[PDB]
Design a binder for this molecule. Sequence first.
Ligand code: MG
Ligand code: MG
Ligand code: MG
Ligand code: MG
Ligand code: MG
Ligand code: MG
Ligand code: MG
Ligand code: MG
Ligand code: MG
Ligand code: MG
Ligand code: MG
Ligand code: MG
Ligand code: MG
Ligand code: MG
Ligand code: MG
Ligand code: MG
Ligand code: MG
Ligand code: MG
Ligand code: MG
Ligand code: MG
Ligand code: ZN
Ligand code: ZN
Lengths: 30, 33, 36, 49, 183
Amino acid sequence: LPTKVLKISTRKTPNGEGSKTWETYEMRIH
Amino acid sequence: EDRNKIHQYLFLTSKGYVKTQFSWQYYYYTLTE
Amino acid sequence: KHKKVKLAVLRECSNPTCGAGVFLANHKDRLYCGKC
Amino acid sequence: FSHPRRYGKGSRQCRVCSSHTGLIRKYGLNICRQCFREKANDIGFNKFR
Amino acid sequence: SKKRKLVADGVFYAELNEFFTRELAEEGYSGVEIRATRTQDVLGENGRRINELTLLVQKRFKYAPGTGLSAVAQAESMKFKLLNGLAIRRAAYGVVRYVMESGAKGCEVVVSGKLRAARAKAMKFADGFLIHSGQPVNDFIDTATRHVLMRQGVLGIKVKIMRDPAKSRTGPKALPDAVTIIE
RNA sequence: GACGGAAGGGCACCACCAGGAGUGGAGCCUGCGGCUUAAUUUGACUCAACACGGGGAAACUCACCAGGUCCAGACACAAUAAGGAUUGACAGAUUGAGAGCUCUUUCUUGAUUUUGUGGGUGGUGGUGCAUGGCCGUUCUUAGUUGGUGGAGUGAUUUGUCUGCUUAAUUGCGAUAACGAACGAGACCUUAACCUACUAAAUAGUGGUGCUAGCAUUUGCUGGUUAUCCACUUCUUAGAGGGACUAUCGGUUUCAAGCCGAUGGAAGUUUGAGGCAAUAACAGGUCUGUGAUGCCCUUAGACGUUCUGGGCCGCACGCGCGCUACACUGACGGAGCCAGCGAGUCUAACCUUGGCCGAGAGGUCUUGGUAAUCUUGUGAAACUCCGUCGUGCUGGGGAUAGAGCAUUGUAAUUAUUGCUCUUCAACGAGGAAUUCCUAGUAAGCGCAAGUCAUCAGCUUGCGUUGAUUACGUCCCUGCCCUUUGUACACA
Ligand SMILES: [Mg+2]
Ligand SMILES: [Mg+2]
Ligand SMILES: [Mg+2]
Ligand SMILES: [Mg+2]
Ligand SMILES: [Mg+2]
Ligand SMILES: [Mg+2]
Ligand SMILES: [Mg+2]
Ligand SMILES: [Mg+2]
Ligand SMILES: [Mg+2]
Ligand SMILES: [Mg+2]
Ligand SMILES: [Mg+2]
Ligand SMILES: [Mg+2]
Ligand SMILES: [Mg+2]
Ligand SMILES: [Mg+2]
Ligand SMILES: [Mg+2]
Ligand SMILES: [Mg+2]
Ligand SMILES: [Mg+2]
Ligand SMILES: [Mg+2]
Ligand SMILES: [Mg+2]
Ligand SMILES: [Mg+2]
Ligand SMILES: [Zn+2]
Ligand SMILES: [Zn+2]
């Protein structure tokens, strides 16, 4: 089967200061 | 008696007589001796 | 802040709900049970 | 002592906080983003690229 | 669904350990799999804790009447030891004294917070060989971090260990640098 | 050591060149100040504040204010307990109120809690200058240490370096060093190719018992959701293969290597990322945490709630932006091309397909827990065929009026949409300034997050696809040496 990645793009910081850096976690099913 | 329905819904969270632990909003009220 | 005052002591309505300690209100027209 | 609060953000609360802030209603988990990455890897959500 | 499902495999798998280093910590918890440090006080007074909350596992979680080479076990191994009271100077070298000749490559322990109320102590205690980093760390480390609540200023540990890649016990057999032949 | 406005080197499109694409000039969107305010909650102010705290706020959120409920002050001592403590109460005056807030009234529920001492204890209340954690920046950087030996009484130094070279303390080389470990690299994810083994009405293609139509000696184009037969080339992806700069030139010095060429699926580390050393900094967050020290507070509450308003309020400056100024354009048929992706059990999510409708939308089923249905998401730029011949004219859609819907207890200060009239600058933007080297820039629209609702936002995505350099310190910055110091709080 084709696998579908589950992606949750959330910004890396709790507050709203820094550079606007994001990061995508994956869930890889099969 | 409003209080009396819960007393054996079981078998004053303070004086011990049941220890409390939170973990997400619906109250794991688990018992003493 | 209320008193429900002490009553230098003392009809009736229906339903085994209202249990004979339910003497209806001494006003006028009153068919009222202090229970509810 | 209550009035219609059926939908919206006052409705949904964080599992770990009841924090109405930062909700992520994706994949039926319902946690805020401050909150999630702390509890991230233990769900099998990892980082590859 | 199936997406909203395999998440719920894990997001149910998750809140458990929120409920585990809260209730079984003093009773010696290591990790769900139930990995543990101490293991009687998990059962209870021959029955006091075994079922005190399996009976609450249901009447909270929708059920019915009837259905030292790890850091997360070593970052609380002796997190008690601090809030009970010892020197934070030699006690920390003890644990990296401990695991290191347990055939283990590398270990590192830090304590962060107010030793004395200032811009706050952050001293660090290492010993050994700690690969970091790339992909070979996910394989070879364990690190835990537990907030320590003492009466004047919260502090916090960041323990790290590493598996001896030689006596690996699973997966790769040595560092991906590995070189050797015979003369 | 750190620092210098001292000297060498070395390096970067948060530096420049050669050029590309834009903003600051206009309307409007949004965020910041201001200002106004009962309140306009607030954090952040250089790169590293200002479409940033998911911060797209109508209630909520809500922290703000004008008001109004509540005990959800456990419990320990001490008081009304069994000659009723005490909560509740329908309606009425009150009040926003179908609020017993409260007043009258007399009912009334029943050792449940009413009161002070004491103790709690909730807090988006204060202190990111008491903290955890995490995060951001130096750093889109090459650095860092120890063993034995050498040098020093010593702190220290050597190793860790002239010179090349590399993206790099990457290596050749040189060497009082030698041999090492961390960092870079290796490692891991993804976009490509395999005519190969391993493969299927959930994928895609021929083909058959046969079926639809133009020509008609057998082809055109199909149709056949429980009608048969085939295939692994596409797809997808299990196991693996393959790129090693391989080979041969151009220049090397002895090489380390850099500029060509062929092979070619693949020549900037093959492309794009994930990780990440030794140390930092009063950096940001108590407005994420049942993380929180200590204080402030705890019954006319700063707790929680109900009602209503506010964060968006405009002589103004600024930041991320969207629609453009039109003839490579706009209007109009119409050809019709994606890829990335999400979706409903105590339930209303993805809506085909019907049918009403001017559209918005209505209504009606239906498939879909999902390679099956929505979905070939029949996207847009596009583009083929027409149209309007350069005014501010339709370019432009701003302000502004009238009418129909959709969400929602609740759209008024237009949530949002569709229709008709309105038709404001703006005529390519000053000083400045950004981003950028290949499937890149740029244009285009599409999903997902947000979401009851709402994009001019975000994270991604594919369609279309250039110019130009494949270089240097001239500026701005950073790293290594040398040097000076009365700095070490550096
Ligand atoms: Mg809250
Ligand atoms: Mg690496
Ligand atoms: Mg230029
Ligand atoms: Mg402010
Ligand atoms: Mg504050
Ligand atoms: Mg500042
Ligand atoms: Mg910077
Ligand atoms: Mg309110
Ligand atoms: Mg609140
Ligand atoms: Mg602050
Ligand atoms: Mg020596
Ligand atoms: Mg000596
Ligand atoms: Mg040295
Ligand atoms: Mg700080
Ligand atoms: Mg705002
Ligand atoms: Mg501006
Ligand atoms: Mg529909
Ligand atoms: Mg207009
Ligand atoms: Mg935004
Ligand atoms: Mg220069
Ligand atoms: Zn009655
Ligand atoms: Zn949370």
